[PDB]
Amino acid sequence: MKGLDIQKVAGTWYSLAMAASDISLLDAQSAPLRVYVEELKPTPEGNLEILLQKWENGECAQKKIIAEKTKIPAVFKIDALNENKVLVLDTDYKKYLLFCMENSPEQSLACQCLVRTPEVDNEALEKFDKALKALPMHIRLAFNPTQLEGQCHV
Amino acid sequence: LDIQKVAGTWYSLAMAASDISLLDAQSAPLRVYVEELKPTNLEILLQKWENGECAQKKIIAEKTKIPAVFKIDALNENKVLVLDTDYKKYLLFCMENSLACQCLVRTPEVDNEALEKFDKALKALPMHIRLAFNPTQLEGQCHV
Ligand SMILES: CCCCCCCCCCO
Numbered sequence: 586m587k588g589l590d591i592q593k594v595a596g597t598w599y600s601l602a603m604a605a606s607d608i609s610l611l612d613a614q615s616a617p618l619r620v621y622v623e624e625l626k627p628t629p630e631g632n633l634e635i636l637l638q639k640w641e642n643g644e645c646a647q648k649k650i651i652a653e654k655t656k657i658p659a660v661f662k663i664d665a666l667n668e669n670k671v672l673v674l675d676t677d678y679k680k681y682l683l684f685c686m687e688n689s690p691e692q693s694l695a696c697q698c699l700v701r702t703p704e705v706d707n708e709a710l711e712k713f714d715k716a717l718k719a720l721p722m723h724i725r726l727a728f729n730p731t732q733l734e735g736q737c738h739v
Numbered sequence: 740l741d742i743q744k745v746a747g748t749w750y751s752l753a754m755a756a757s758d759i760s761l762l763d764a765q766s767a768p769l770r771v772y773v774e775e776l777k778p779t780n781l782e783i784l785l786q787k788w789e790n791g792e793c794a795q796k797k798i799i800a801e802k803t804k805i806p807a808v809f810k811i812d813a814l815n816e817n818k819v820l821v822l823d824t825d826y827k828k829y830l831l832f833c834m835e836n837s838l839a840c841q842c843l844v845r846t847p848e849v850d851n852e853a854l855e856k857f858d859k860a861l862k863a864l865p866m867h868i869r870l871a872f873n874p875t876q877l878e879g880q881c882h883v
Pocket residue numbers: 618620622625633635637650652663665666671673684686
């Protein structure tokens with residue numbers, strides 16, 4: 586994304602849809618990139634604090650992770666994915682944000698459609714599918730408002 | 740629809756369902772790999788992960804007055820609709836139990852044209868999960 590301002594993505598978000606290059610990255614509730622974003626917190630240094638939910642050890646756990654700015658705009662590095670990358674594809678800031686993440690990387694990618702509100706946004710999902718046409722995705726999940734308002738989308 | 744021309748070997752290239760839980764996980768109830776269609780009515784031979792093993796199953800899809808519509812006789816009759824086929828390359832179907840649809844192909848290879856017809860056929864439908872498999876998976880056992 587040309588000209589990302591992370592100061593305009595601060596707030597609460599929902600994981601409306603997910604897609605991955607490998608079925609195993611998302612297939613089960615405990616799959617490793619089956620993560621539900623809840624909050625983006627930009628820091629004055631230009632990093633991104635991310636609150637998310639992940640199902641592990643048979644419960645819905647809260648995680649704080651740090652996404653570090655890099656020399657490539659809209660690209661961040663995560664400690665928690667073995668210094669592998671988050672790529673922001675697109676955002677209108679006010680409604681949706683499309684990102685991809687490398688599995689803990691060259692070879693496996695999971696992407697999500699984030700929305701500010703727990704509602705189905707077909708405009709957001711259209712842009713998501715448009716930007717995925719390029720990518721070899723083999724699994725796609727779309728979630729309903731009940732899931733979005735739940736804990737770990739259940 | 741000529742059940743005789745659909746006879747023979749098939750591969751489940753892609754699957755989509757209305758509810759994530761129908762397809763999500765190897766053990767999900769509608770995660771089924773079609774292997775062969777035999778006219779008798781349509782006998783369906785398939786593989787399914789059940790109880791941590793790749794099991795073979797045979798189900799009977801009973802003819803109806805509508806050539807493309809079959810009813811799986813089971814405790815609960817499930818309707819099968821053959822949406823489209825060219826007999827030689829691909830066959831698209833949906834099964835109602837909630838909705839699961841598949842793109843079958845005649846060889847264990849990616850047919851992007853067959854996948855395009857699949858996605859186009861599914862645009863109306865409220866699908867929340869979609870899986871597509873690779874040659875290695877297709878040639879394997881329960882797409883492992
Ligand atoms: C800009 C928003 C990107 C969210 C990154 C999510 C990364 C999750 C890492 C998995 O433990």
